[PDB]
Design an enzyme around this catalytic site. Sequence first.
Site, PDB file in Angstrom:
ATOM      1  N   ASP A  59      50.816  22.382  20.138  1.00  0.00           N
ATOM      2  CA  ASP A  59      50.304  23.691  19.753  1.00  0.00           C
ATOM      3  C   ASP A  59      48.834  23.603  19.374  1.00  0.00           C
ATOM      4  O   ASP A  59      48.485  23.147  18.285  1.00  0.00           O
ATOM      5  CB  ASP A  59      51.110  24.273  18.595  1.00  0.00           C
ATOM      6  CG  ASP A  59      50.812  25.746  18.360  1.00  0.00           C
ATOM      7  OD1 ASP A  59      49.809  26.251  18.909  1.00  0.00           O
ATOM      8  OD2 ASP A  59      51.646  26.422  17.726  1.00  0.00           O
ATOM      9  N   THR A  60      47.980  24.024  20.296  1.00  0.00           N
ATOM     10  CA  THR A  60      46.540  24.018  20.085  1.00  0.00           C
ATOM     11  C   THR A  60      46.140  24.992  18.973  1.00  0.00           C
ATOM     12  O   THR A  60      45.105  24.818  18.328  1.00  0.00           O
ATOM     13  CB  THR A  60      45.810  24.405  21.381  1.00  0.00           C
ATOM     14  OG1 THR A  60      46.253  25.698  21.814  1.00  0.00           O
ATOM     15  CG2 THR A  60      46.103  23.385  22.478  1.00  0.00           C
ATOM     16  N   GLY A  61      47.021  25.942  18.676  1.00  0.00           N
ATOM     17  CA  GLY A  61      46.740  26.959  17.668  1.00  0.00           C
ATOM     18  C   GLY A  61      47.046  26.511  16.249  1.00  0.00           C
ATOM     19  O   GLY A  61      46.654  27.171  15.288  1.00  0.00           O
TER      20      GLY A  61
HETATM   21  C1  J3W Z   1      58.710  32.071  21.040  1.00  0.00           C
HETATM   22  O1  J3W Z   1      58.269  32.277  19.692  1.00  0.00           O
HETATM   23  C2  J3W Z   1      56.914  32.157  19.625  1.00  0.00           C
HETATM   24  O2  J3W Z   1      56.277  31.737  20.591  1.00  0.00           O
HETATM   25  N1  J3W Z   1      56.277  32.460  18.491  1.00  0.00           N
HETATM   26  C3  J3W Z   1      54.851  32.160  18.319  1.00  0.00           C
HETATM   27  C4  J3W Z   1      54.684  31.132  17.184  1.00  0.00           C
HETATM   28  O3  J3W Z   1      54.815  31.463  16.006  1.00  0.00           O
HETATM   29  N2  J3W Z   1      54.771  29.855  17.602  1.00  0.00           N
HETATM   30  N3  J3W Z   1      54.860  28.987  16.771  1.00  0.00           N
HETATM   31  C5  J3W Z   1      53.724  28.063  16.933  1.00  0.00           C
HETATM   32  C6  J3W Z   1      52.736  28.164  15.766  1.00  0.00           C
HETATM   33  C7  J3W Z   1      51.945  29.473  15.871  1.00  0.00           C
HETATM   34  C8  J3W Z   1      50.641  29.367  15.068  1.00  0.00           C
HETATM   35  O4  J3W Z   1      49.754  28.483  15.756  1.00  0.00           O
HETATM   36  C9  J3W Z   1      50.035  30.622  14.988  1.00  0.00           C
HETATM   37  C10 J3W Z   1      48.983  30.821  14.101  1.00  0.00           C
HETATM   38  C11 J3W Z   1      49.191  31.529  12.919  1.00  0.00           C
HETATM   39  C12 J3W Z   1      48.192  31.590  11.953  1.00  0.00           C
HETATM   40  C13 J3W Z   1      47.011  30.881  12.132  1.00  0.00           C
HETATM   41  C14 J3W Z   1      46.796  30.195  13.322  1.00  0.00           C
HETATM   42  C15 J3W Z   1      47.777  30.165  14.306  1.00  0.00           C
HETATM   43  C16 J3W Z   1      45.986  30.945  11.191  1.00  0.00           C
HETATM   44  C17 J3W Z   1      46.489  30.993   9.892  1.00  0.00           C
HETATM   45  C18 J3W Z   1      46.845  29.845   9.186  1.00  0.00           C
HETATM   46  C19 J3W Z   1      47.013  28.614   9.815  1.00  0.00           C
HETATM   47  N4  J3W Z   1      48.409  28.515  10.288  1.00  0.00           N
HETATM   48  C20 J3W Z   1      48.758  27.577  11.264  1.00  0.00           C
HETATM   49  O5  J3W Z   1      47.872  26.894  11.773  1.00  0.00           O
HETATM   50  C21 J3W Z   1      50.050  27.577  11.789  1.00  0.00           C
HETATM   51  C22 J3W Z   1      50.659  26.180  11.613  1.00  0.00           C
HETATM   52  C23 J3W Z   1      50.597  25.781  10.133  1.00  0.00           C
HETATM   53  C24 J3W Z   1      52.120  26.185  12.074  1.00  0.00           C
HETATM   54  N5  J3W Z   1      49.980  27.957  13.227  1.00  0.00           N
HETATM   55  C25 J3W Z   1      50.883  28.867  13.775  1.00  0.00           C
HETATM   56  O6  J3W Z   1      51.671  29.423  13.009  1.00  0.00           O
HETATM   57  C26 J3W Z   1      55.984  28.293  16.976  1.00  0.00           C
HETATM   58  C27 J3W Z   1      57.189  28.995  16.915  1.00  0.00           C
HETATM   59  C28 J3W Z   1      57.995  29.094  18.043  1.00  0.00           C
HETATM   60  C29 J3W Z   1      59.222  29.746  17.977  1.00  0.00           C
HETATM   61  C30 J3W Z   1      59.622  30.364  16.799  1.00  0.00           C
HETATM   62  C31 J3W Z   1      60.822  30.946  16.735  1.00  0.00           C
HETATM   63  C32 J3W Z   1      61.556  30.975  15.611  1.00  0.00           C
HETATM   64  C33 J3W Z   1      62.724  31.647  15.720  1.00  0.00           C
HETATM   65  C34 J3W Z   1      62.796  32.531  16.808  1.00  0.00           C
HETATM   66  S1  J3W Z   1      61.293  32.184  17.754  1.00  0.00           S
HETATM   67  C35 J3W Z   1      58.826  30.253  15.664  1.00  0.00           C
HETATM   68  C36 J3W Z   1      57.619  29.559  15.717  1.00  0.00           C
HETATM   69  C37 J3W Z   1      54.104  33.477  18.057  1.00  0.00           C
HETATM   70  C38 J3W Z   1      52.653  33.202  17.646  1.00  0.00           C
HETATM   71  C39 J3W Z   1      54.111  34.299  19.343  1.00  0.00           C
HETATM   72  C40 J3W Z   1      54.814  34.273  16.957  1.00  0.00           C
END
Ligand code: J3W
Lengths: 99, 99
Positions: A25-27
């Site tokens: 996850d690049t994000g």
């Molecule tokens: C298919 O679902 C998704 O693709 N969800 C995505 C998603 O949440 N994907 N998750 C990957 C992490 C997303 C994100 O980069 C998204 C993101 C959120 C906030 C920020 C940056 C990126 C900035 C704020 C604070 C910093 N937070 C983070 O860096 C966090 C990190 C600590 C985990 N980063 C993230 O949370 C991973 C993820 C994947 C699946 C699920 C599922 C849970 C139950 C059903 S789906 C939850 C989380 C989406 C953004 C579209 C909501």
Amino acid sequence: PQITLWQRPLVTIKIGGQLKEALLDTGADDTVLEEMSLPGRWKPKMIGGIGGFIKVRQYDQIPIEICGHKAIGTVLVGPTPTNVIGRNLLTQIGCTLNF
Amino acid sequence: PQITLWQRPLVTIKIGGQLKEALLDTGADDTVLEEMSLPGRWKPKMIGGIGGFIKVRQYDQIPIEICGHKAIGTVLVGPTPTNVIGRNLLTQIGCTLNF
Ligand SMILES: COC(=O)N[C@H](C(=O)NN(CCC[C@@]1(O)Cc2ccc(cc2)C/C=C\CNC(=O)[C@H](C(C)C)NC1=O)Cc1ccc(-c2cccs2)cc1)C(C)(C)C
Ligand SMILES: [Cl-]
Ligand SMILES: [Cl-]
Ligand SMILES: [Cl-]
């Protein structure tokens, strides 16, 4: 390798003697794994994402192997709905985005 | 470009004629933007992140430029911590992961 994004970029990691599947996850600032045991010191942390914050345990200087690339860094453990590998480790294995 | 991950992979996007900053996020299936106006009808979606679930408004077939690269696809609008560009649009602009 080159990894396509038609599908979720899932890889095997080795950490704490265990093999696990995780999402590149690049994000993500941080690396966050579902509940597991790790050795050494830890301290609490709240991390945020879509839907709000969860509380995790922060371990530092943890060895990890990703796609057979070794690195060391901080690993957060808690009730994340899926294993994510974040930038703090992606940097160490020379992972970049390209287009 | 080739983008390294020592910092957040933040880029400028253009949508509805306006510039915004957004995060290139390979762990995201979907693209989710902070509250804004978009044309046409929307459908409901519930999406799940690290912190839990949110409701968003799904708009389809929306033109959006990402770092100067043209895409047209699905954009979700709702209460997200930041603008996130997910794999649905990353695939349109020819993005891969490389290490
Ligand atoms: C298919 O679902 C998704 O693709 N969800 C995505 C998603 O949440 N994907 N998750 C990957 C992490 C997303 C994100 O980069 C998204 C993101 C959120 C906030 C920020 C940056 C990126 C900035 C704020 C604070 C910093 N937070 C983070 O860096 C966090 C990190 C600590 C985990 N980063 C993230 O949370 C991973 C993820 C994947 C699946 C699920 C599922 C849970 C139950 C059903 S789906 C939850 C989380 C989406 C953004 C579209 C909501
Ligand atoms: Cl680290
Ligand atoms: Cl580098
Ligand atoms: Cl799309």
